[PDB]
Design a protein around this nucleic acid. Structure first.
Ligand SMILES: Nc1ncnc2c1ncn2[C@@H]1O[C@H](COP(=O)(O)OP(=O)(O)OP(O)(O)=S)[C@@H](O)[C@H]1O
Ligand SMILES: Nc1ncnc2c1ncn2[C@@H]1O[C@H](COP(=O)(O)OP(=O)(O)O)[C@@H](O)[C@H]1O
Ligand SMILES: Nc1ncnc2c1ncn2[C@@H]1O[C@H](COP(=O)(O)OP(=O)(O)O)[C@@H](O)[C@H]1O
Ligand SMILES: [Mg+2]
Ligand SMILES: [Mg+2]
Ligand SMILES: [Mg+2]
Ligand SMILES: [Mg+2]
Lengths: 48, 313, 309, 312, 312, 312, 312
DNA sequence: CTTCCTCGAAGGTTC
DNA sequence: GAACCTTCGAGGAAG
């Protein structure tokens, strides 16, 4: 699942978010089992 | 409230108003959202109000924002996640959006899905995001500054236009009933003629006339009171302010119509260069009272016959 | 006090003062707030003074700030949160507010609410009824959507000789100086139609009377003081007299270019154009022409030369 | 000292000097600060020197700064708030202050208070900061560059004028006693008449004549040395420099006195157009040697008799 | 080295050298810093060279910088903190400095002090910087671009003049020795006559002739080699280019000497209107080949004999 | 998608299409990349579509960007570095990119290498990067605005032009079939006539006419319905749009038919001169509605009779 | 590659080659760099290639940049800091360089040093950078557009001209040998006739003709095939471009033959003024298609008979 | 984003 | 009608 965690962090950065804040934002998500799509989708939903 | 809520009450704009009704009904005769729509026109014609009415006639929620508030792609993609299927996204000042976001919006409008690429380039992988169907409605004061690729995505265009006297008069009649005052149709027409065709101005004049009519009268706006009110305010029957008359009078009497430079005119009336160029001169050009030339401003024959002076070529 | 406090004290400005009375009285009768007012015009005519009168006539407490001080949205949001129902907010030099601050001000005026983003967090505010008052010399510098939201526009104008004569007497009593009616008139002619200039001359004449006289202003002492200051009976300065004399005696009244004239009087070009010519053209002593500027018949009669067509 | 310190030592400027005396004396009788003063006029006539004299006659401390050193409102607010009752604030080259900073002085000069933003977030507040009585003095060469609302707030206006031969001769004699040199009253007048009416130029000529008198002479300035030194510098008895003479000569010998355009004349002297109009032509016109007309420059009768030609 | 190092080597400029010598000698007797000096005049006459000569004669180290290298007040303030007592500061191309920085020199030149803002920003104050005695040397081609208050502060003004044929011949001979070449005195005079009175042009021609003489010759610049090389470069014996010859010939053959207007002449020569007036016409007027008049320009007798046509 | 993928599917542009075929097939015989190609002409004629067809005929990957999207050299270097041997780069509105970007495109297009400086102060380096074979395809609406040194690098030119009724009728029919819409040969002829000779407009109108027939009809596009639908859309019988009608009407009523300048006209009606000059004036000229004169544009009699104004 | 590499390969420009041979050879006997060289003339004549040849003959590396690319001084300093002893720096379009940047080269070219401010804040200091010997090469279209102090520093000037028909014919024969192709002398001469005496145009047309002969012919170029290929392109039977046809048509029809100014003409054809002044006008004059007058350009009768009008 | 300044126009005189 | 000269006004690019 670490790959999906890294992918979601990198994808959020590819959206223009800062690497530090993007790591925190994705790290702030609880469920690790959810796919990278959900991880990025959840992070963006939480950032609203 | 002073905003109409349905096509029942949205006075004027019949050309654009008629088109939208047919397209909205055709969308209802199918399980489809409305096509992306773009509204053009000068400021204060009702662009914002028309977006709200569109949402009510569709019977769907409306999201409000402006281009400058969207500073990064995550904001737009995040806002898009807050949308339900069929929701309307209204973005004002769309010409002020940042370039980095514009290139991604294309996929959302046409594909309703987004892809993001990561990795150094030697090794790379994508992520695919699928979005609910939606209709984007953009409002702008300037169409030409919208890039051609963006322009191609908008499937409906609607020109707003200045309201004519038969329609602007009705807006005064309507607004007079939200207050507690009776207004004679002749008086309402005298206000409409001086409102430069903009609803926001007609409302502002009526408010001032109401104050006079309840302090210097019996609280009724009759034609006699309207003349006195329009005499304390110096608004000419063509809508010229006091200073607009002073500019034209000066050019005709002292310079024989010109050409005369902007700096020479400014010091004659005792005004600032910026104020004459941006507050008064723009409306005088639309009415055709003056023209701008390589050697300065010049008065036209339309100004001579209006001020009441003989003309000489 | 040097600033009038009520309309019964505010001399002149009959057009603007008459309109403001009607709208203020109507607002009281309806128990509503006053509409947004914009004051603009030339320097020293009463723009700041009028704003304080409006607050006293409404019977409210005035909140005061200035455009140069408000640098970012957080500043304005904090200021607006201190408003109570019916309060009046006055912003001086409103033309200096940054564009970012102006945008926030649009919705505050139309819908009385603020919804803006500013470790960042969202802020949402829904404001009570309030009146914004603005004063500026460069109204052309404001954004077009902002100007469209003001409801009352007050354009200031120059004063007449009977008005300024009364203003001088009012100020003379504050200094407890004794001045005769014809002495007050002789200062009005020279004050160029501006109250601040009328007070400035009185202050200088007082100093002369307290050192070269018995501390009393009369038609004789005034003549001596005005001769030392060297201000003509039409209000022309020593340099203004030198310009006209040069044009009439060296170029036959013109036409002459600005650069040629500036070098002949040993002055910087920008000083003549921006500091001296404006009053000469407005009073009708000089005219601008495609090939230069020329002295009019009024200049010949005033300076004492024989005019020839 | 080279700069005068009191009105007793300040030669000339009778109009401005006489006015300032009355206003200073009246202010002392009322025990209150002096009104705001603006000093302007041509270069080198004594604007800076007068600003110090005003402080000495008032008997108060003088705080000095300059427009170029003030770059933002934070700097000005720091200069203010450090003023005590009756202090005098002198700003040289005041026309260089940014326009965004000048608009802070509008309230300070009329009501002695300024607006300040303080605190952070919800705690931010705007409050009046109240200043004691003070007198602002400004000196500038470009008065037309100041904003119209700012010039309207200065209560006293001093416009400087050029000097005359009697006053310049006395200035030359005074300076000749700061240095340890003897100068004959005839030699002093010879330098004063060539100084174009400006004290700084008179001091410059004396310094150059001194170097000659102590290298090519016995260390004393007399009628004989002055004539030789002025011949080496090549300054005409009217103050016309070498290039100034060449201009007049060329107009008389090739164009018959004109009219001639500036472009035509510049090429004949090998000087570029921008130097002739800004360095040499201004003084020649002000003194009546040249006349400007729609047809071009023309030499006056005064120029013919000075160069020795016939006014045919 | 090509650049002279002392007044004994600096050929020409007799008027400028004589003045500087007297002022430098008097300064040493008093053991004081020299007054500020401004060097100006046409391009290539020796301004930058003379600035070093002044430093060598005064016996001090020279600090060097340029107008375009200084962009903000923080740059100039940093430079002035390095000056030691008696140091000379040389600013080349001084007309390029921005007006915001030029106005900072006003106090440094007259009173040797600067006003600076110091402190963290919460607490800050204005304080004087006090500079030791120093001499500023400036060189400029466009003296008219300097503000009036700046030019008034320079105590010594040096205006450079073009060189005469006798002096310019010595410069050619001296330079040949540095190149270790041998040149006949008759050839040195041929180059000097074509160098338009300018040392830089004389050096440029010599360098080209030298290269030619060693590739197709025996390594000696004789009178015959010089004519062949100068023909390759297409330099007339009066220093005219082929373009200049085309201008003069046209006026004689198609207009009989004129008068003719500049617009008509430009078309008949296929040359740009402004280029002709700014690049070629100035030298032809100064040499007396062409004369301007109210009706147009006319070719003089000198232009006829130079081209070999018959004057009438 | 509606856009064609091969030259067999690309209708019209016989001139451009015939030339490209020869150059594309000749390059295959030599097994090498195609020369750089520049496409120019009015918007909506098929410039973007053509680039995709060329890529498909070559069998190569296509990369896309735009003039405004590139801001600094580092941006372009990344794009170029990602190329693969044979890749095609398509840049839209190549006339709008910054001058500092064009610096690098010259070296790349001419010799396939770049030299990018890196480092500052004591650090300073340059990277010489070799690029693989590639083909640049440019597109613009304004040809005369393209930088002259850049325009010389393009080896193939394609001038696009308007489509005729036979081609447009085939396009209209094709597009309707993709939507599975039924249109008779009569109605399709009306839309082609009233669509300003441009495929983008023809497709844009067809979607709107469909909605009308689905409500005010039985889902069948009849000729009677097409006329009522087009009139409801405010499309003139000559296909002139809202902007077109406003231009001519403003000339006749406010200027008596002209002459009037492009700027003046574009200022009275709230329109950008770049839009009026690019999309509208070219069409109005080819169809004889507007004529060009030394004084400006003038309306012909045809415009007068169409708009319904009695000719003078 | 097509670019020649030695003077034996560089066809034409005999005058320039003859002079450069002497100076380059002389500079090799001594162990030093060549003097700064300036090349000017129409675009596409081969001056960039000349910079490569000089570097190959001297045996050093060639660095390349352009005028518009150097936006600020810090850019140029970085370039100068990266030159090896004897390197050649070629600056294209040097006339378009910013004025404040040009003023830095004055010291580098003449004395090989520059004075630069380095660091920031308290680290601001002046450093005297010493440069190794190098040779600058500049290229510009206009000679009369450089400043006098810059133009005076170049030691060698080179003027380039259009190639004659015998030279271009040999250039076509050479280029048609790098491509493995066969061309008959009639085609080579016929093709050169169209190429406006410019090798750049000749190479572009030759490549296109080769593609046609390989697909629509027998793989051999003959006069019959050359006419067909050129007729399929827009090249006229005497080399006129479509832009030239556009120009002549407008002069005859919209202005009545002239005279007309290029300012108003440029905006009517929608072309950048620099293109018509540099690329088109010179050829139309040098071939008798256009004639020049005091008021402007005028079309000759030869133009009327070519466009098909009646020279009434 | 603002100040500065230079490009293009046209009015007036003499020959 | 040809040639010089002065003055003004609106762009536009260099701080
Ligand atoms: N058709 C209409 N009928 C009645 N009132 C109208 C109509 N159109 C506009 N108004 C009035 O005009 C006011 C301003 O409308 P807006 O929607 O702000 O126009 P606008 O185009 O948004 O102007 P902007 O956005 O500030 S440029 C509304 O509050 C209405 O009272
Ligand atoms: N020859 C053609 N055949 C089929 N469709 C075309 C043709 N030309 C244009 N189109 C269609 O019209 C639109 C043209 O857009 P585009 O090619 O981007 O024009 P441009 O690139 O000139 O703006 C597309 O929807 C395209 O499918
Ligand atoms: N004398 C010549 N012999 C052979 N090829 C030449 C010659 N002159 C120019 N060329 C070729 O023609 C083109 C000229 O381009 P270039 O030298 O860059 O011209 P410019 O530098 O003026 O733009 C190049 O392809 C070059 O190889
Ligand atoms: Mg709105
Ligand atoms: Mg005020
Ligand atoms: Mg001073
Ligand atoms: Mg030098």
């Amino acid at each position: 699942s670490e790959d999906a965690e890294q992918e979601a962090v990198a994808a959020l950065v590819a959206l223009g978010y800062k690497p530090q804040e993007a790591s925190r934002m994705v790290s702030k998500i609880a469920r690790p089992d959810a796919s990278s799509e959900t991880l990025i989708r959840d992070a963006l939903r939480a950032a609203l | 409230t002073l905003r109409p809520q349905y096509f029942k009450e949205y006075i004027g704009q019949d050309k654009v108003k008629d088109q939208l009704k047919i397209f909205i009904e055709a969308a209802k005769l199918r399980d489809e959202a409305l096509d992306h729509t773009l509204l053009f026109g000068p400021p204060g014609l009702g662009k914002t109000t028309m977006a709200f009415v569109i949402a009510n006639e569709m019977g769907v929620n409306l999201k409000q924002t402006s281009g400058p508030a969207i500073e990064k792609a995550g904001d737009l993609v995040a806002i898009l996640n807050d949308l339900e299927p069929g929701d309307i996204l209204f973005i004002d000042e769309i010409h002020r959006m940042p370039m980095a976001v514009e290139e991604v919006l294309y996929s959302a409008m046409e594909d309703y899905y987004i892809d993001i690429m990561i990795g150094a380039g030697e090794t790379s992988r994508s992520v695919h995001l699928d979005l609910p169907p939606f209709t984007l409605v953009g409002a702008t004061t300037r169409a030409g500054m919208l890039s051609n690729p963006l322009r191609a995505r908008f499937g409906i265009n609607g020109h707003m236009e200045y309201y004519e006297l038969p329609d602007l008069t009705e807006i005064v009649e309507r607004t007079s009933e939200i207050f507690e005052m009776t207004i004679t149709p002749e008086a309402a027409l005298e206000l409409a003629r001086r409102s430069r065709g903009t609803p926001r101005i007609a409302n502002r004049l009526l408010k001032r006339v109401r104050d006079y009519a309840q302090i210097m009268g019996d609280g009724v706006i009759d034609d006699k009171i309207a003349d006195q009110a329009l005499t304390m305010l110096d608004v000419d029957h063509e809508g010229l302010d006091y200073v607009d008359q002073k500019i034209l009078r000066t050019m005709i009497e002292m310079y024989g119509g010109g050409p005369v430079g902007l700096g020479t005119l400014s010091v004659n009336i005792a005004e600032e260069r910026e104020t004459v160029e941006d507050m008064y001169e723009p409306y005088l050009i639309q009415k055709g009272f003056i023209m701008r030339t390589r050697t300065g401003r010049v008065a036209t024959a339309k100004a001579y016959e209006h001020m009441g002076y003989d003309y000489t070529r």
